[PDB]
PDB file of all heavy atoms in Angstrom:
ATOM      1  N   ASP P  31      12.500 -11.461  18.693  1.00  0.00           N
ATOM      2  CA  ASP P  31      11.128 -11.790  19.052  1.00  0.00           C
ATOM      3  C   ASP P  31      10.193 -10.586  19.079  1.00  0.00           C
ATOM      4  O   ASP P  31       8.998 -10.745  18.812  1.00  0.00           O
ATOM      5  CB  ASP P  31      11.105 -12.483  20.414  1.00  0.00           C
ATOM      6  CG  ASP P  31       9.749 -13.060  20.748  1.00  0.00           C
ATOM      7  OD1 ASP P  31       9.421 -14.147  20.229  1.00  0.00           O
ATOM      8  OD2 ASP P  31       9.003 -12.420  21.518  1.00  0.00           O
ATOM      9  N   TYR P  32      10.695  -9.392  19.375  1.00  0.00           N
ATOM     10  CA  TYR P  32       9.845  -8.252  19.672  1.00  0.00           C
ATOM     11  C   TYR P  32      10.033  -7.153  18.636  1.00  0.00           C
ATOM     12  O   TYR P  32      11.158  -6.870  18.214  1.00  0.00           O
ATOM     13  CB  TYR P  32      10.143  -7.690  21.066  1.00  0.00           C
ATOM     14  CG  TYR P  32       9.814  -8.607  22.230  1.00  0.00           C
ATOM     15  CD1 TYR P  32      10.677  -9.630  22.605  1.00  0.00           C
ATOM     16  CD2 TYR P  32       8.652  -8.432  22.966  1.00  0.00           C
ATOM     17  CE1 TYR P  32      10.382 -10.458  23.671  1.00  0.00           C
ATOM     18  CE2 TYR P  32       8.348  -9.254  24.031  1.00  0.00           C
ATOM     19  CZ  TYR P  32       9.217 -10.265  24.378  1.00  0.00           C
ATOM     20  OH  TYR P  32       8.919 -11.086  25.438  1.00  0.00           O
ATOM     21  N   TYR P  33       8.927  -6.531  18.236  1.00  0.00           N
ATOM     22  CA  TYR P  33       8.964  -5.397  17.329  1.00  0.00           C
ATOM     23  C   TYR P  33       9.397  -4.145  18.086  1.00  0.00           C
ATOM     24  O   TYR P  33       9.288  -4.065  19.312  1.00  0.00           O
ATOM     25  CB  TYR P  33       7.594  -5.158  16.691  1.00  0.00           C
ATOM     26  CG  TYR P  33       7.260  -6.025  15.494  1.00  0.00           C
ATOM     27  CD1 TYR P  33       7.556  -7.384  15.476  1.00  0.00           C
ATOM     28  CD2 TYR P  33       6.638  -5.478  14.379  1.00  0.00           C
ATOM     29  CE1 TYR P  33       7.242  -8.168  14.388  1.00  0.00           C
ATOM     30  CE2 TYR P  33       6.324  -6.254  13.283  1.00  0.00           C
ATOM     31  CZ  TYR P  33       6.629  -7.598  13.294  1.00  0.00           C
ATOM     32  OH  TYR P  33       6.318  -8.377  12.208  1.00  0.00           O
ATOM     33  N   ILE P  34       9.893  -3.149  17.347  1.00  0.00           N
ATOM     34  CA  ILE P  34      10.332  -1.900  17.962  1.00  0.00           C
ATOM     35  C   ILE P  34       9.590  -0.743  17.314  1.00  0.00           C
ATOM     36  O   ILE P  34       9.601  -0.603  16.086  1.00  0.00           O
ATOM     37  CB  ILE P  34      11.857  -1.708  17.837  1.00  0.00           C
ATOM     38  CG1 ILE P  34      12.600  -2.864  18.504  1.00  0.00           C
ATOM     39  CG2 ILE P  34      12.291  -0.384  18.426  1.00  0.00           C
ATOM     40  CD1 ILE P  34      12.491  -2.874  20.005  1.00  0.00           C
ATOM     41  N   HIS P  35       8.963   0.095  18.132  1.00  0.00           N
ATOM     42  CA  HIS P  35       8.259   1.274  17.638  1.00  0.00           C
ATOM     43  C   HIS P  35       9.005   2.532  18.053  1.00  0.00           C
ATOM     44  O   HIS P  35       9.688   2.545  19.090  1.00  0.00           O
ATOM     45  CB  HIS P  35       6.821   1.334  18.164  1.00  0.00           C
ATOM     46  CG  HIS P  35       5.923   0.258  17.638  1.00  0.00           C
ATOM     47  ND1 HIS P  35       4.638   0.518  17.212  1.00  0.00           N
ATOM     48  CD2 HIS P  35       6.094  -1.078  17.513  1.00  0.00           C
ATOM     49  CE1 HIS P  35       4.073  -0.607  16.811  1.00  0.00           C
ATOM     50  NE2 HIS P  35       4.936  -1.590  16.983  1.00  0.00           N
ATOM     51  N   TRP P  36       8.883   3.581  17.253  1.00  0.00           N
ATOM     52  CA  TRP P  36       9.547   4.862  17.532  1.00  0.00           C
ATOM     53  C   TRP P  36       8.508   5.951  17.783  1.00  0.00           C
ATOM     54  O   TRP P  36       7.802   6.362  16.856  1.00  0.00           O
ATOM     55  CB  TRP P  36      10.458   5.243  16.383  1.00  0.00           C
ATOM     56  CG  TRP P  36      11.706   4.449  16.288  1.00  0.00           C
ATOM     57  CD1 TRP P  36      11.962   3.418  15.450  1.00  0.00           C
ATOM     58  CD2 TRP P  36      12.895   4.650  17.064  1.00  0.00           C
ATOM     59  NE1 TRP P  36      13.238   2.949  15.641  1.00  0.00           N
ATOM     60  CE2 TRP P  36      13.827   3.696  16.632  1.00  0.00           C
ATOM     61  CE3 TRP P  36      13.252   5.529  18.075  1.00  0.00           C
ATOM     62  CZ2 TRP P  36      15.101   3.599  17.179  1.00  0.00           C
ATOM     63  CZ3 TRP P  36      14.514   5.448  18.610  1.00  0.00           C
ATOM     64  CH2 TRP P  36      15.420   4.484  18.166  1.00  0.00           C
ATOM     65  N   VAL P  37       8.468   6.461  19.007  1.00  0.00           N
ATOM     66  CA  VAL P  37       7.466   7.438  19.390  1.00  0.00           C
ATOM     67  C   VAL P  37       8.176   8.742  19.742  1.00  0.00           C
ATOM     68  O   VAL P  37       9.362   8.763  20.088  1.00  0.00           O
ATOM     69  CB  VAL P  37       6.596   6.924  20.566  1.00  0.00           C
ATOM     70  CG1 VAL P  37       7.357   6.957  21.891  1.00  0.00           C
ATOM     71  CG2 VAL P  37       5.247   7.647  20.648  1.00  0.00           C
ATOM     72  N   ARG P  38       7.452   9.851  19.600  1.00  0.00           N
ATOM     73  CA  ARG P  38       7.994  11.160  19.908  1.00  0.00           C
ATOM     74  C   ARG P  38       6.924  12.018  20.565  1.00  0.00           C
ATOM     75  O   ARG P  38       5.726  11.762  20.442  1.00  0.00           O
ATOM     76  CB  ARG P  38       8.535  11.855  18.654  1.00  0.00           C
ATOM     77  CG  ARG P  38       7.471  12.385  17.719  1.00  0.00           C
ATOM     78  CD  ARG P  38       8.091  13.229  16.629  1.00  0.00           C
ATOM     79  NE  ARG P  38       7.082  13.919  15.836  1.00  0.00           N
ATOM     80  CZ  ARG P  38       7.350  14.858  14.942  1.00  0.00           C
ATOM     81  NH1 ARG P  38       8.590  15.251  14.703  1.00  0.00           N
ATOM     82  NH2 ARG P  38       6.348  15.421  14.272  1.00  0.00           N
ATOM     83  N   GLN P  39       7.385  13.038  21.289  1.00  0.00           N
ATOM     84  CA  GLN P  39       6.502  14.006  21.938  1.00  0.00           C
ATOM     85  C   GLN P  39       7.074  15.399  21.725  1.00  0.00           C
ATOM     86  O   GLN P  39       8.170  15.705  22.207  1.00  0.00           O
ATOM     87  CB  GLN P  39       6.352  13.716  23.431  1.00  0.00           C
ATOM     88  CG  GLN P  39       5.720  14.863  24.217  1.00  0.00           C
ATOM     89  CD  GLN P  39       5.457  14.519  25.670  1.00  0.00           C
ATOM     90  OE1 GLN P  39       6.286  13.893  26.329  1.00  0.00           O
ATOM     91  NE2 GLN P  39       4.306  14.941  26.183  1.00  0.00           N
ATOM     92  N   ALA P  40       6.346  16.229  20.994  1.00  0.00           N
ATOM     93  CA  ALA P  40       6.641  17.649  20.932  1.00  0.00           C
ATOM     94  C   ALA P  40       6.155  18.322  22.212  1.00  0.00           C
ATOM     95  O   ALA P  40       5.211  17.845  22.845  1.00  0.00           O
ATOM     96  CB  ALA P  40       5.969  18.263  19.708  1.00  0.00           C
ATOM     97  N   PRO P  41       6.794  19.417  22.635  1.00  0.00           N
ATOM     98  CA  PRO P  41       6.308  20.126  23.827  1.00  0.00           C
ATOM     99  C   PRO P  41       4.980  20.818  23.555  1.00  0.00           C
ATOM    100  O   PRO P  41       4.785  21.433  22.504  1.00  0.00           O
ATOM    101  CB  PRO P  41       7.423  21.136  24.124  1.00  0.00           C
ATOM    102  CG  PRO P  41       8.102  21.335  22.832  1.00  0.00           C
ATOM    103  CD  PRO P  41       8.040  20.015  22.126  1.00  0.00           C
ATOM    104  N   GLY P  42       4.066  20.705  24.515  1.00  0.00           N
ATOM    105  CA  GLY P  42       2.731  21.237  24.346  1.00  0.00           C
ATOM    106  C   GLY P  42       1.833  20.407  23.461  1.00  0.00           C
ATOM    107  O   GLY P  42       0.752  20.867  23.088  1.00  0.00           O
ATOM    108  N   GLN P  43       2.248  19.193  23.107  1.00  0.00           N
ATOM    109  CA  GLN P  43       1.459  18.318  22.255  1.00  0.00           C
ATOM    110  C   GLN P  43       1.516  16.902  22.799  1.00  0.00           C
ATOM    111  O   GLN P  43       2.432  16.530  23.536  1.00  0.00           O
ATOM    112  CB  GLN P  43       1.951  18.322  20.800  1.00  0.00           C
ATOM    113  CG  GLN P  43       1.841  19.650  20.058  1.00  0.00           C
ATOM    114  CD  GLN P  43       0.423  19.975  19.618  1.00  0.00           C
ATOM    115  OE1 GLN P  43       0.053  19.735  18.470  1.00  0.00           O
ATOM    116  NE2 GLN P  43      -0.365  20.549  20.520  1.00  0.00           N
ATOM    117  N   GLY P  44       0.517  16.112  22.424  1.00  0.00           N
ATOM    118  CA  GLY P  44       0.516  14.712  22.781  1.00  0.00           C
ATOM    119  C   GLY P  44       1.502  13.913  21.955  1.00  0.00           C
ATOM    120  O   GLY P  44       2.092  14.397  20.990  1.00  0.00           O
ATOM    121  N   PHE P  45       1.684  12.660  22.360  1.00  0.00           N
ATOM    122  CA  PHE P  45       2.564  11.758  21.637  1.00  0.00           C
ATOM    123  C   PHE P  45       1.971  11.400  20.278  1.00  0.00           C
ATOM    124  O   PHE P  45       0.766  11.509  20.045  1.00  0.00           O
ATOM    125  CB  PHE P  45       2.794  10.478  22.435  1.00  0.00           C
ATOM    126  CG  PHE P  45       3.814  10.606  23.522  1.00  0.00           C
ATOM    127  CD1 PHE P  45       3.476  11.163  24.742  1.00  0.00           C
ATOM    128  CD2 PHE P  45       5.105  10.145  23.331  1.00  0.00           C
ATOM    129  CE1 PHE P  45       4.413  11.267  25.749  1.00  0.00           C
ATOM    130  CE2 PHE P  45       6.047  10.246  24.334  1.00  0.00           C
ATOM    131  CZ  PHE P  45       5.702  10.811  25.542  1.00  0.00           C
ATOM    132  N   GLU P  46       2.841  10.964  19.374  1.00  0.00           N
ATOM    133  CA  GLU P  46       2.415  10.460  18.078  1.00  0.00           C
ATOM    134  C   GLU P  46       3.459   9.469  17.591  1.00  0.00           C
ATOM    135  O   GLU P  46       4.625   9.531  17.990  1.00  0.00           O
ATOM    136  CB  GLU P  46       2.207  11.597  17.070  1.00  0.00           C
ATOM    137  CG  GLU P  46       3.481  12.252  16.576  1.00  0.00           C
ATOM    138  CD  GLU P  46       3.249  13.652  16.042  1.00  0.00           C
ATOM    139  OE1 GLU P  46       2.089  13.980  15.715  1.00  0.00           O
ATOM    140  OE2 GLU P  46       4.227  14.425  15.947  1.00  0.00           O
ATOM    141  N   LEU P  47       3.026   8.546  16.741  1.00  0.00           N
ATOM    142  CA  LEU P  47       3.887   7.467  16.280  1.00  0.00           C
ATOM    143  C   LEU P  47       4.507   7.815  14.935  1.00  0.00           C
ATOM    144  O   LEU P  47       3.823   8.291  14.027  1.00  0.00           O
ATOM    145  CB  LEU P  47       3.098   6.165  16.157  1.00  0.00           C
ATOM    146  CG  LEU P  47       3.897   4.977  15.625  1.00  0.00           C
ATOM    147  CD1 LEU P  47       5.046   4.645  16.552  1.00  0.00           C
ATOM    148  CD2 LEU P  47       3.027   3.782  15.428  1.00  0.00           C
ATOM    149  N   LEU P  48       5.812   7.578  14.815  1.00  0.00           N
ATOM    150  CA  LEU P  48       6.492   7.740  13.536  1.00  0.00           C
ATOM    151  C   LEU P  48       6.454   6.450  12.721  1.00  0.00           C
ATOM    152  O   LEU P  48       6.034   6.455  11.561  1.00  0.00           O
ATOM    153  CB  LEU P  48       7.931   8.205  13.762  1.00  0.00           C
ATOM    154  CG  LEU P  48       8.023   9.432  14.664  1.00  0.00           C
ATOM    155  CD1 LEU P  48       9.467   9.814  14.913  1.00  0.00           C
ATOM    156  CD2 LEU P  48       7.249  10.591  14.065  1.00  0.00           C
ATOM    157  N   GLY P  49       6.882   5.342  13.311  1.00  0.00           N
ATOM    158  CA  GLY P  49       6.859   4.084  12.594  1.00  0.00           C
ATOM    159  C   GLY P  49       7.332   2.947  13.471  1.00  0.00           C
ATOM    160  O   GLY P  49       7.560   3.114  14.672  1.00  0.00           O
ATOM    161  N   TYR P  50       7.469   1.778  12.848  1.00  0.00           N
ATOM    162  CA  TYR P  50       7.967   0.613  13.563  1.00  0.00           C
ATOM    163  C   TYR P  50       8.810  -0.253  12.641  1.00  0.00           C
ATOM    164  O   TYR P  50       8.774  -0.123  11.415  1.00  0.00           O
ATOM    165  CB  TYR P  50       6.835  -0.210  14.197  1.00  0.00           C
ATOM    166  CG  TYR P  50       5.926  -0.971  13.255  1.00  0.00           C
ATOM    167  CD1 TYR P  50       6.170  -2.306  12.942  1.00  0.00           C
ATOM    168  CD2 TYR P  50       4.800  -0.369  12.715  1.00  0.00           C
ATOM    169  CE1 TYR P  50       5.332  -3.007  12.098  1.00  0.00           C
ATOM    170  CE2 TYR P  50       3.948  -1.067  11.880  1.00  0.00           C
ATOM    171  CZ  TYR P  50       4.226  -2.381  11.568  1.00  0.00           C
ATOM    172  OH  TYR P  50       3.387  -3.077  10.730  1.00  0.00           O
ATOM    173  N   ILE P  51       9.569  -1.145  13.269  1.00  0.00           N
ATOM    174  CA  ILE P  51      10.554  -1.989  12.609  1.00  0.00           C
ATOM    175  C   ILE P  51      10.470  -3.398  13.186  1.00  0.00           C
ATOM    176  O   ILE P  51      10.197  -3.587  14.382  1.00  0.00           O
ATOM    177  CB  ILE P  51      11.978  -1.389  12.745  1.00  0.00           C
ATOM    178  CG1 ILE P  51      12.992  -2.074  11.827  1.00  0.00           C
ATOM    179  CG2 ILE P  51      12.460  -1.342  14.177  1.00  0.00           C
ATOM    180  CD1 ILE P  51      12.751  -1.871  10.388  1.00  0.00           C
ATOM    181  N   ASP P  52      10.609  -4.386  12.304  1.00  0.00           N
ATOM    182  CA  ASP P  52      10.836  -5.762  12.715  1.00  0.00           C
ATOM    183  C   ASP P  52      12.335  -6.016  12.674  1.00  0.00           C
ATOM    184  O   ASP P  52      12.931  -5.939  11.593  1.00  0.00           O
ATOM    185  CB  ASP P  52      10.111  -6.721  11.783  1.00  0.00           C
ATOM    186  CG  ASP P  52      10.022  -8.149  12.323  1.00  0.00           C
ATOM    187  OD1 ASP P  52      10.837  -8.568  13.173  1.00  0.00           O
ATOM    188  OD2 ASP P  52       9.118  -8.876  11.866  1.00  0.00           O
ATOM    189  N   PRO P  53      12.983  -6.313  13.801  1.00  0.00           N
ATOM    190  CA  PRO P  53      14.437  -6.530  13.765  1.00  0.00           C
ATOM    191  C   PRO P  53      14.844  -7.839  13.115  1.00  0.00           C
ATOM    192  O   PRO P  53      16.016  -7.988  12.749  1.00  0.00           O
ATOM    193  CB  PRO P  53      14.827  -6.493  15.247  1.00  0.00           C
ATOM    194  CG  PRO P  53      13.605  -6.949  15.944  1.00  0.00           C
ATOM    195  CD  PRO P  53      12.449  -6.393  15.170  1.00  0.00           C
ATOM    196  N   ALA P  54      13.921  -8.794  12.978  1.00  0.00           N
ATOM    197  CA  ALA P  54      14.272 -10.100  12.426  1.00  0.00           C
ATOM    198  C   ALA P  54      14.592 -10.014  10.937  1.00  0.00           C
ATOM    199  O   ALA P  54      15.620 -10.525  10.482  1.00  0.00           O
ATOM    200  CB  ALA P  54      13.140 -11.094  12.678  1.00  0.00           C
ATOM    201  N   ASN P  55      13.723  -9.365  10.160  1.00  0.00           N
ATOM    202  CA  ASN P  55      13.900  -9.283   8.716  1.00  0.00           C
ATOM    203  C   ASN P  55      14.088  -7.857   8.213  1.00  0.00           C
ATOM    204  O   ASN P  55      14.175  -7.648   6.998  1.00  0.00           O
ATOM    205  CB  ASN P  55      12.721  -9.946   7.996  1.00  0.00           C
ATOM    206  CG  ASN P  55      11.374  -9.416   8.455  1.00  0.00           C
ATOM    207  OD1 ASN P  55      11.289  -8.474   9.240  1.00  0.00           O
ATOM    208  ND2 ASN P  55      10.306 -10.028   7.961  1.00  0.00           N
ATOM    209  N   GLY P  56      14.145  -6.877   9.106  1.00  0.00           N
ATOM    210  CA  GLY P  56      14.365  -5.504   8.686  1.00  0.00           C
ATOM    211  C   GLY P  56      13.183  -4.851   8.012  1.00  0.00           C
ATOM    212  O   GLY P  56      13.365  -3.865   7.296  1.00  0.00           O
ATOM    213  N   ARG P  57      11.978  -5.359   8.229  1.00  0.00           N
ATOM    214  CA  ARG P  57      10.796  -4.785   7.596  1.00  0.00           C
ATOM    215  C   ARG P  57      10.354  -3.530   8.334  1.00  0.00           C
ATOM    216  O   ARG P  57      10.049  -3.603   9.531  1.00  0.00           O
ATOM    217  CB  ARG P  57       9.658  -5.793   7.573  1.00  0.00           C
ATOM    218  CG  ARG P  57       8.411  -5.293   6.865  1.00  0.00           C
ATOM    219  CD  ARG P  57       7.342  -6.370   6.815  1.00  0.00           C
ATOM    220  NE  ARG P  57       6.834  -6.702   8.140  1.00  0.00           N
ATOM    221  CZ  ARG P  57       5.879  -6.031   8.768  1.00  0.00           C
ATOM    222  NH1 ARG P  57       5.280  -4.995   8.206  1.00  0.00           N
ATOM    223  NH2 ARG P  57       5.513  -6.411   9.988  1.00  0.00           N
ATOM    224  N   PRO P  58      10.322  -2.369   7.681  1.00  0.00           N
ATOM    225  CA  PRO P  58       9.773  -1.180   8.328  1.00  0.00           C
ATOM    226  C   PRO P  58       8.326  -0.917   7.964  1.00  0.00           C
ATOM    227  O   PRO P  58       7.760  -1.539   7.060  1.00  0.00           O
ATOM    228  CB  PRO P  58      10.683  -0.072   7.805  1.00  0.00           C
ATOM    229  CG  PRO P  58      10.965  -0.503   6.400  1.00  0.00           C
ATOM    230  CD  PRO P  58      10.909  -2.027   6.375  1.00  0.00           C
ATOM    231  N   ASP P  59       7.729   0.024   8.685  1.00  0.00           N
ATOM    232  CA  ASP P  59       6.466   0.625   8.291  1.00  0.00           C
ATOM    233  C   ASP P  59       6.417   2.016   8.903  1.00  0.00           C
ATOM    234  O   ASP P  59       6.880   2.222  10.027  1.00  0.00           O
ATOM    235  CB  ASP P  59       5.265  -0.215   8.724  1.00  0.00           C
ATOM    236  CG  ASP P  59       3.982   0.201   8.033  1.00  0.00           C
ATOM    237  OD1 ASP P  59       4.028   1.105   7.172  1.00  0.00           O
ATOM    238  OD2 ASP P  59       2.924  -0.385   8.345  1.00  0.00           O
ATOM    239  N   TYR P  60       5.863   2.957   8.147  1.00  0.00           N
ATOM    240  CA  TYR P  60       6.029   4.377   8.393  1.00  0.00           C
ATOM    241  C   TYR P  60       4.667   5.053   8.476  1.00  0.00           C
ATOM    242  O   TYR P  60       3.665   4.534   7.978  1.00  0.00           O
ATOM    243  CB  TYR P  60       6.869   5.004   7.274  1.00  0.00           C
ATOM    244  CG  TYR P  60       8.309   4.532   7.239  1.00  0.00           C
ATOM    245  CD1 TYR P  60       8.708   3.522   6.367  1.00  0.00           C
ATOM    246  CD2 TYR P  60       9.260   5.078   8.093  1.00  0.00           C
ATOM    247  CE1 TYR P  60      10.020   3.085   6.325  1.00  0.00           C
ATOM    248  CE2 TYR P  60      10.580   4.653   8.062  1.00  0.00           C
ATOM    249  CZ  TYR P  60      10.949   3.651   7.177  1.00  0.00           C
ATOM    250  OH  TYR P  60      12.256   3.214   7.150  1.00  0.00           O
ATOM    251  N   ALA P  61       4.629   6.217   9.121  1.00  0.00           N
ATOM    252  CA  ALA P  61       3.401   6.997   9.134  1.00  0.00           C
ATOM    253  C   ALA P  61       3.142   7.588   7.753  1.00  0.00           C
ATOM    254  O   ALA P  61       4.039   7.676   6.909  1.00  0.00           O
ATOM    255  CB  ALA P  61       3.467   8.109  10.178  1.00  0.00           C
ATOM    256  N   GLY P  62       1.887   7.984   7.530  1.00  0.00           N
ATOM    257  CA  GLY P  62       1.485   8.448   6.211  1.00  0.00           C
ATOM    258  C   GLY P  62       2.121   9.766   5.814  1.00  0.00           C
ATOM    259  O   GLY P  62       2.499   9.960   4.656  1.00  0.00           O
ATOM    260  N   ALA P  63       2.255  10.688   6.766  1.00  0.00           N
ATOM    261  CA  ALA P  63       2.766  12.014   6.451  1.00  0.00           C
ATOM    262  C   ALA P  63       4.285  12.078   6.364  1.00  0.00           C
ATOM    263  O   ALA P  63       4.814  13.101   5.918  1.00  0.00           O
ATOM    264  CB  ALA P  63       2.276  13.026   7.489  1.00  0.00           C
ATOM    265  N   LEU P  64       5.005  11.029   6.774  1.00  0.00           N
ATOM    266  CA  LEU P  64       6.461  11.103   6.845  1.00  0.00           C
ATOM    267  C   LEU P  64       7.149   9.934   6.147  1.00  0.00           C
ATOM    268  O   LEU P  64       8.201   9.484   6.612  1.00  0.00           O
ATOM    269  CB  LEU P  64       6.933  11.183   8.300  1.00  0.00           C
ATOM    270  CG  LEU P  64       6.329  12.265   9.199  1.00  0.00           C
ATOM    271  CD1 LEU P  64       6.806  12.121  10.632  1.00  0.00           C
ATOM    272  CD2 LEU P  64       6.652  13.647   8.663  1.00  0.00           C
ATOM    273  N   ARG P  65       6.590   9.434   5.043  1.00  0.00           N
ATOM    274  CA  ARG P  65       7.208   8.309   4.348  1.00  0.00           C
ATOM    275  C   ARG P  65       8.497   8.698   3.627  1.00  0.00           C
ATOM    276  O   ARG P  65       9.369   7.842   3.446  1.00  0.00           O
ATOM    277  CB  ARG P  65       6.207   7.693   3.363  1.00  0.00           C
ATOM    278  CG  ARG P  65       6.611   6.328   2.812  1.00  0.00           C
ATOM    279  CD  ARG P  65       5.408   5.485   2.432  1.00  0.00           C
ATOM    280  NE  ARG P  65       5.788   4.122   2.076  1.00  0.00           N
ATOM    281  CZ  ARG P  65       4.994   3.067   2.197  1.00  0.00           C
ATOM    282  NH1 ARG P  65       3.765   3.178   2.672  1.00  0.00           N
ATOM    283  NH2 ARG P  65       5.447   1.869   1.836  1.00  0.00           N
TER     284      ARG P  65
END
Side-chain angles (χ1 to χ4, degrees):
Chain P
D31 190 79
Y32 294 80
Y33 278 42
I34 301 290
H35 293 224
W36 287 101
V37 74
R38 74 171 189 170
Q39 166 175 42
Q43 296 284 262
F45 280 81
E46 72 202 341
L47 178 62
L48 308 177
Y50 70 94
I51 192 66
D52 194 337
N55 53 6
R57 183 177 66 84
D59 194 3
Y60 293 98
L64 307 175
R65 193 152 188 153

